[PDB]
Amino acid sequence: PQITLWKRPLVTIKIGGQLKEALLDTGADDTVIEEMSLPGRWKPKMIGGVGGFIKVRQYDQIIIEIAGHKAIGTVLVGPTPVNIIGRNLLTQIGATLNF
Amino acid sequence: PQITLWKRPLVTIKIGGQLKEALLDTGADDTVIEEMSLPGRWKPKMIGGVGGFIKVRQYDQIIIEIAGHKAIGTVLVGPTPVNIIGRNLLTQIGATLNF
Ligand SMILES: COc1ccc(S(=O)(=O)N(CC(C)C)C[C@@H](O)[C@H](Cc2ccccc2)NC(=O)O[C@H]2CO[C@H]3O[C@@H]4OCC[C@@H]4[C@H]32)cc1
Ligand SMILES: [Cl-]
Numbered sequence: 001p002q003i004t005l006w007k008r009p010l011v012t013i014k015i016g017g018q019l020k021e022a023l024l025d026t027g028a029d030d031t032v033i034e035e036m037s038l039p040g041r042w043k044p045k046m047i048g049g050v051g052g053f054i055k056v057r058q059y060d061q062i063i064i065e066i067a068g069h070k071a072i073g074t075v076l077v078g079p080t081p082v083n084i085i086g087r088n089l090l091t092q093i094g095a096t097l098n099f
Numbered sequence: 100p101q102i103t104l105w106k107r108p109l110v111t112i113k114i115g116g117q118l119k120e121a122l123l124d125t126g127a128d129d130t131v132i133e134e135m136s137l138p139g140r141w142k143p144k145m146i147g148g149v150g151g152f153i154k155v156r157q158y159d160q161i162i163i164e165i166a167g168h169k170a171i172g173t174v175l176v177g178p179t180p181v182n183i184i185g186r187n188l189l190t191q192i193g194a195t196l197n198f
């Protein structure tokens with residue numbers, strides 16, 4: 001698809017057997033999801049953004065389905081105000097910015 | 100252009116006769132740049148993201164060139180960690196997300 005930017009570019013994702021709404025976010029290096037359980041190992045991380053840092057759990061090798069397209073990568077879990085799909089997974093679904 | 104996301108989507112912007120680097124950010128509703136002087140009156144705004152909220156100065160109808168494309172619109176100025184071009188100006192330069 002081609003997604004215009006008049007509105008927030010929200011898509012449905014499937015992660016950890018759950019459906020969620022998430023923002024396609026080219027300004028995010030990393031994918032950050034609100035609190036949920038994920039299987040396997042994790043390690044703590046701090047991530048920054050506009051208003052300072054939050055502490056998250058970093059899970060590697062997580063499969064996600066993004067608007068129908070499967071991808072695998074690192075997912076950060078913690079108190080983000082918005083579920084964000086960052087570049088680490090946008091690349092895997094072949095997303096580009098065009099103008 | 101078509102911009103892939105393996106790297107941060109940084110472009111050159113020109114505002115007040117000055118070149119700066121900024122992130123093309125589909126996850127940002129608005130454009131936020133680091134402290135600088137802009138002409139005219141400003142209005143208060145609070146914006147929020149990953150680690151909470153910041154106060155910014157809202158300047159309307161500011162001339163800004165983005166990757167060679169001319170825009171005129173609202174620019175927020177404040178203690179953002181990075182210059183961000185949000186959807187209010189991405190729409191003015193014709194940007195879409197494609198996959
Ligand atoms: C109303 O208008 C707005 C309101 C909010 C914002 S924002 O900057 O807070 N943000 C909103 C989004 C979280 C819902 C836009 C994001 O694209 C920011 C944009 C952003 C980039 C860098 C620093 C601050 C903000 N990215 C971000 O938080 O990324 C996180 C996740 O991955 C890392 O990549 C980034 O680079 C490393 C740190 C951040 C980490 C911008 C304009
Ligand atoms: Cl919206």
Ligand SMILES: [Cl-]
Pocket residue numbers: 010011012013066067068
């Ligand atoms: Cl979707």
Ligand SMILES: [Cl-]
Pocket residue numbers: 072073074088089
């Ligand atoms: Cl990854």
Ligand SMILES: [Cl-]
Pocket residue numbers: 094103
């Ligand atoms: Cl590619």
Ligand SMILES: [Cl-]
Pocket residue numbers: 105106107
């Ligand atoms: Cl980079």
Ligand SMILES: [Cl-]
Pocket residue numbers: 171172173187188
């Ligand atoms: Cl505007």
Ligand code: NA
Pocket residue numbers: 039040041059060061062
């Ligand atoms: Na893992």
Ligand code: NA
Pocket residue numbers: 138139140158159160161
């Ligand atoms: Na003005």
